[PDB]
């Protein structure tokens, strides 16, 4: 339950922070934010997208194939009389 104070042994690290009221909440949207969203997107698209593309194809096929097998095969009545 109580942990702050006995977590880790740290030495020689200085940190600097500003009050929330002295800064912008959502700063550098175009110079930083978006450029990074692109970076992130880019670096994961070929890891993620591929398998989903594969599933999408299999879906398409199997769906079409299913409907195709519902159609009539003209070659079943060529010599019917």
């Amino acid at each position: 339950g109580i942990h702050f104070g006995n977590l880790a042994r740290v030495r020689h690290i200085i940190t600097y922070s500003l009050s929330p009221f002295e800064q912008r909440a959502i700063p550098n949207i175009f110079s930083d934010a978006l450029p990074n969203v692109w970076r992130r997107f880019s670096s994961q698209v070929f890891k993620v997208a591929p398998p989903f593309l594969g599933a999408y194809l299999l879906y398409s096929w199997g769906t079409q194939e299913f409907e195709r097998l519902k159609r009539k095969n003209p070659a079943d009545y060529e010599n019917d009389q």
Partner: protein
Amino acid sequence: ATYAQTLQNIPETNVTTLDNGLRVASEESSQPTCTVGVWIGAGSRYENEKNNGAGYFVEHLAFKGTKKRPCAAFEKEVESMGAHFNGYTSREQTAFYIKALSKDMPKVVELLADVVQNCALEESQIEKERGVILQELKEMDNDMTNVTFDYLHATAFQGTALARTVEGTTENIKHLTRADLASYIDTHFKAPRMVLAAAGGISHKELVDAARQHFSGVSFTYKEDAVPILPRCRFTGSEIRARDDALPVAHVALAVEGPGWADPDNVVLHVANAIIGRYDRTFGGGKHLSSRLAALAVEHKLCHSFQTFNTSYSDTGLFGFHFVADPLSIDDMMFCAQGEWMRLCTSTTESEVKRAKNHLRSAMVAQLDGTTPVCETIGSHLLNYGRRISLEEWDSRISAVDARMVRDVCSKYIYDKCPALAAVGPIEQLLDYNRIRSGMYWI
């Protein structure tokens, strides 16, 4: 002989100004001994990125001899007359003063003037002190309290001049030139920006005379007799955290921007700080101390010590507190501390201020306990208020303070403000800025 009467019967402080712009002030008593010195309105705040720590470097040579008399000579002469030579340099103020027999007030004045005007700046002595100053920076680096206050200024006034330390940077100390120090002295140690103050058994007219004789070198242009107003230093709510769990105890300092010398509210802030007080593990009073925070500290063993402060400056200042505690009691201490600050703005009592006012009176009276401290008051007062302020005036002001006034002033400077935080040592238990910021309202 009542308190009131004793206050009115205190000899007045005499001030006169020379044509060069220098001011000479002094309070006369019947003491065979006296203190006289020159308080200069100079310091690190007046320096910049390239000459930071010059004023300090100078403070090191201001006693190693002048042109009229080299080191040994200067020293022997001062020593052989039983006089004490001390001085100091801060962010906005510097001072060189001497303690001696009133019988020498005049020879001393000549000595002072020689120090502030003809420092030898011995090229060889400079390289010798360069190494000394470097040793003091390593000594002072182990003074957590002072490391902590430096950091407090570093962040509270980040980006500005008050952010720099008085001693200066390592790079600067390693590269300051004989020319830079020279330049420093010339640019800052100037008559209109100085004050010749003395206290003890001395003739104001005899003082002012020796003053006319040695403090001369008048100015021709207008740029030489104008006291330059410094550019404002922006206060910033923020924190700097230097963590080292290898240190035995942690130091913490929290503060909000203060008004600045000239503001009357300072009388109230000092009464306020008097209510919270201060404490340290050797106060016999123990669990019975009037200061609530102090009492809690004792009961719950919240810290080794804590102190309040109202550090003034020309246009700004730092009002806050500082405590030393074990890594595991930082959170509770900070809690109780911020708690007391809320109580101030919200529920101060008449009884509380009554006590704090008394405590404050005997505090001001105690700062005039000797020639040096009184001389220090004069130098500072003329330099900050441009006039001496009698104990009777202070007392007049202190007496007007009441609970309501305390709440209003404190609410003004404390309530819901973004503070400046500096923490050093084993500070893992100190909660984040946001949590601390929330301790700034309601309680």
